[PDB]
Amino acid sequence: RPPVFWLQGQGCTGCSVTLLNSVHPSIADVLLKVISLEFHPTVMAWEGEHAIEHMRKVAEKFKGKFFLVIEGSVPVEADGKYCIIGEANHHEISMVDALKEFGPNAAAVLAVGTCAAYGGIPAAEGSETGATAVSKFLGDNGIKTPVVNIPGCPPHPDWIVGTVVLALDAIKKNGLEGGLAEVVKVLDSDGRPTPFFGRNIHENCPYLDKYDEGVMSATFTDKVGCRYDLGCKGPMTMADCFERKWNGGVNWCVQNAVCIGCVEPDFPDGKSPFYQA
Amino acid sequence: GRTTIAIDPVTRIEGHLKAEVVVENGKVVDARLSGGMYRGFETILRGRDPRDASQIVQRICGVCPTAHSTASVLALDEAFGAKVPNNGRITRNLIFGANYLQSHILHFYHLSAQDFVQGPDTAPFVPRFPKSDLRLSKELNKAGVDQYIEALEVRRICHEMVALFGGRMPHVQGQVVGGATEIPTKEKLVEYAARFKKVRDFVEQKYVPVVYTIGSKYKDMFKVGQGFKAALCVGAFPLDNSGKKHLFMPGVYAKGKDMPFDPSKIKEYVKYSWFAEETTGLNYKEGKTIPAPDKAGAYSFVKAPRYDGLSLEVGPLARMWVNNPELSPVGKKLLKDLFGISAKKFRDLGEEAAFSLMGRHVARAEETYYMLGAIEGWLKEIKAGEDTVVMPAVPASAEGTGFTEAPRGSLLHYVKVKDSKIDNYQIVSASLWNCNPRDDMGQRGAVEEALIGIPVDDIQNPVNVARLIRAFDPXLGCAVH
Ligand code: SF4
Numbered sequence: 001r002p003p004v005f006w007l008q009g010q011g012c013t014g015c016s017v018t019l020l021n022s023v024h025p026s027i028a029d030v031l032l033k034v035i036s037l038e039f040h041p042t043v044m045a046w047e048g049e050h051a052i053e054h055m056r057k058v059a060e061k062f063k064g065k066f067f068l069v070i071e072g073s074v075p076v077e078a079d080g081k082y083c084i085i086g087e088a089n090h091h092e093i094s095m096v097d098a099l100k101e102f103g104p105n106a107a108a109v110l111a112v113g114t115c116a117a118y119g120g121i122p123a124a125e126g127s128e129t130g131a132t133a134v135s136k137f138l139g140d141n142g143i144k145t146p147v148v149n150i151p152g153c154p155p156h157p158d159w160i161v162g163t164v165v166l167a168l169d170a171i172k173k174n175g176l177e178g179g180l181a182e183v184v185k186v187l188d189s190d191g192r193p194t195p196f197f198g199r200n201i202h203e204n205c206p207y208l209d210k211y212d213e214g215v216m217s218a219t220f221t222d223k224v225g226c227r228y229d230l231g232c233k234g235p236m237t238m239a240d241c242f243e244r245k246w247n248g249g250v251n252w253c254v255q256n257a258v259c260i261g262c263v264e265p266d267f268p269d270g271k272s273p274f275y276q277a
Numbered sequence: 278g279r280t281t282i283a284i285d286p287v288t289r290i291e292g293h294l295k296a297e298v299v300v301e302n303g304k305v306v307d308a309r310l311s312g313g314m315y316r317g318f319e320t321i322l323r324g325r326d327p328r329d330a331s332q333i334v335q336r337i338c339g340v341c342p343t344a345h346s347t348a349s350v351l352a353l354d355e356a357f358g359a360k361v362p363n364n365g366r367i368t369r370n371l372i373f374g375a376n377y378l379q380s381h382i383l384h385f386y387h388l389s390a391q392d393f394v395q396g397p398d399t400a401p402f403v404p405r406f407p408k409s410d411l412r413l414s415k416e417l418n419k420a421g422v423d424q425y426i427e428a429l430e431v432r433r434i435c436h437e438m439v440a441l442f443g444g445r446m447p448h449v450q451g452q453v454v455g456g457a458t459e460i461p462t463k464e465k466l467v468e469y470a471a472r473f474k475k476v477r478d479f480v481e482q483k484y485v486p487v488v489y490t491i492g493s494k495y496k497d498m499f500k501v502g503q504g505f506k507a508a509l510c511v512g513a514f515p516l517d518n519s520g521k522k523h524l525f526m527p528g529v530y531a532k533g534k535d536m537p538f539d540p541s542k543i544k545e546y547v548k549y550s551w552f553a554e555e556t557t558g559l560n561y562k563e564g565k566t567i568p569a570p571d572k573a574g575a576y577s578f579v580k581a582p583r584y585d586g587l588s589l590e591v592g593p594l595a596r597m598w599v600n601n602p603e604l605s606p607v608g609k610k611l612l613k614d615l616f617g618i619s620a621k622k623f624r625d626l627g628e629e630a631a632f633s634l635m636g637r638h639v640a641r642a643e644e645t646y647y648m649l650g651a652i653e654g655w656l657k658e659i660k661a662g663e664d665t666v667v668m669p670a671v672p673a674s675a676e677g678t679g680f681t682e683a684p685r686g687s688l689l690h691y692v693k694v695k696d697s698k699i700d701n702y703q704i705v706s707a708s709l710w711n712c713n714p715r716d717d718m719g720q721r722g723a724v725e726e727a728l729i730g731i732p733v734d735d736i737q738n739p740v741n742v743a744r745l746i747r748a749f750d751p752x753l754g755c756a757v758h
Pocket residue numbers: 201202203205206207208209211226227228232233234235254259
């Protein structure tokens with residue numbers, strides 16, 4: 001069981017909560033048989049320098065073989081001081097330090113959530129912390145470890161468990177190396193798996209006919225017309241929400257209100273204002 | 278003599294927290310809390326269409342996003358002059374009330390229960406302190422494990438309930454200025470009620486009884502963690518359309534005395550916080566957020582809010598203490614059977630036992646029970662098919678404040694609108710009240726002060742430190758924003 005360390009930078013813990021909503025039949029097996037979730041500050045038993053020391057001991061024993069889940073962006077301003085994730089040996093560990101320490105020795109990095117993937121809200125207009133996407137930070141620092149983006153704010157849990165499963169199958173068929181090669185074969189130019197983000201919401205939207213007809217809802221509660229005039233970002237968004245829906249299939253953003261393009265690299269600025277065309 | 282202990286990360290809370298305490302003769306004699314991560318939502322929100330706020334502010338915190346959504350739309354409703362239809366007010370309560378249930382269940386089992394319950398020999402349940410002070414019988418420990426697992430299903434079902442009129446969760450689409458985006462239909466009300474029934478069953482039969490029962494094996498924990506014994510509630514869950522009566526009525530309690538809540542008495546101090554010194558002591562209506570991460574002496578990205586100069590705590594305890602409702606029937610029975618106490622209303626337990634480490638876990642369990650009755654009330658009140666939203670134009674100039682109670686305590690959002698854009702946006706959140714550093718006058722924050730006196734008779738296994746913190750259910754994403 002390869003270890004997984006789940007590091008949170010500038011996140012809102014929403015990527016951990018969304019995962020806790022999973023109904024994927026594989027999820028318990030993943031966590032109980034496939035990998036070992038050795039470090040996760042929200043849920044793990046131990047704390048502080050003890051938790052950090054444990055992570056470091058496991059990292060050493062499994063150098064080259066462990067996986068990093070990163071949630072949240074990495075702020076580079078003010079020498080990394082806008083995100084301190086722990087302390088050990090009387091030394092504060094910034095998110096900047098943690099990525100430079102663990103980044104090089106991981107087998108791969110999953111950047112979960114639009115923050116980690118692309119900058120997301122902490123990087124948007126008016127921010128001041130140098131919040132940076134995982135892949136850009138690692139590249140800027142000459143760390144060549146492969147990164148897969150699983151974006152969304154938050155992602156659907158099936159996008160997270162789904163990517164682990166397709167990664168697990170690729171490695172079982174071909175090893176760590178052949179395995180990883182096969183997974184790039186299914187990533188788009190934004191580093192995200194085409195199984196979940198390969199299709200456009202609008203082209204597959206049940207209100208597409210209304211859109212083509214020019215019939216637009218004038219109030220959120222009119223569920224008959226297209227949501228375009230209310231601000232729907234479906235036309236510019238690539239996700240499978242239209243099919244799997246959210247929270248055990250009970251609803252989704254377009255039925256309920258509007259799509260805000262939460263999975264897209266320009267979220268939120270390129271998707272704003274949210275409530276105008 | 279004196280030992281300093283720094284714990285960073287404090288785990289099994291939301292977000293980035295460091296606690297540093299000094300221990301002398303087996304007790305905490307000083308404490309400092311540091312929120313270590315900053316994003317700066319108050320500045321990121323500047324210049325946007327004000328309607329975008331009710332989406333942006335949710336990413337402050339993925340555990341309590343509906344509290345931020347609610348506070349934001351209430352602020353926007355005021356600023357826009359929008360009259361939320363009766364049915365929209367009730368729908369909002371259904372969306373938000375469902376996450377109170379998720380959030381308290383999450384907190385007790387998935388954050389807190391490992392403080393008292395030993396998990397099995399698999400990560401992330403091991404390794405842990407060699408002397409973890411885990412005192413439960415094999416049977417009660419096994420019930421603890423069994424219920425943590427069941428709770429994983431229950432909390433997920435809560436989020437299903439949220440999503441029914443909410444769109445998805447985390448980060449609801451269903452609340453906007455003017456009300457709620459989707460009219461509850463008969464079918465979907467059947468679906469919400471069916472899930473609510475399974476949650477209700479769990480809270481009544483499993484959750485409230487386990488908190489008392491585990492509590493009964495840790496009676497010493499009712500004797501520590503009092504701090505200032507001062508509380509704030511700002512009101513929440515409007516119960517009619519005229520802003521008068523609320524499920525949780527506002528009030529302040531301090532030094533044995535009840536007084537009204539007047540939001541003009543709130544000031545945020547920054548001497549010990551990483552913000553520019555000239556921004557200290559401002560009410561939220563004049564609030565400024567200018568980060569100063571190199572400032573000498575500071576130790577946190579959390580500002581220090583004071584009420585009329587008082588350091589106050591918030592959360593289920595504060596709400597239940599201020600309001601003093603009837604204890605639940607399970608609590609009444611279990612207090613008698615396991616503690617030898619006959620009580621009828623919350624304050625019957627006494628200030629000392631209520632404002633303690635384990636008292637705060639009991640207040641959360643009780644409040645969860647209290648929330649079932651409110652939700653059942655809303656399920657009766659709601660009308661399938663009745664409009665839930667109005668579509669107001671964005672004003673050129675306005676201001677609004679939304680006050681509510683997040684699962685962790687008092688929350689408010691203030692917005693100033695100018696040239697039809699956000700000119701100022703200020704947030705005073707729950708964990709900002711609890712997990713804040715010293716103010717300009719050197720008075721400690723509520724959790725900092727509640728740490729004083731906490732027993733640490735073994736410096737190598739200092740378990741009670743994070744236990745005290747976890748009883749407040751901190752989320753530092755909320756505290757710092
Ligand atoms: S604009 Fe939105 S609601 Fe309209 S057809 Fe496209 S995806 Fe569907």
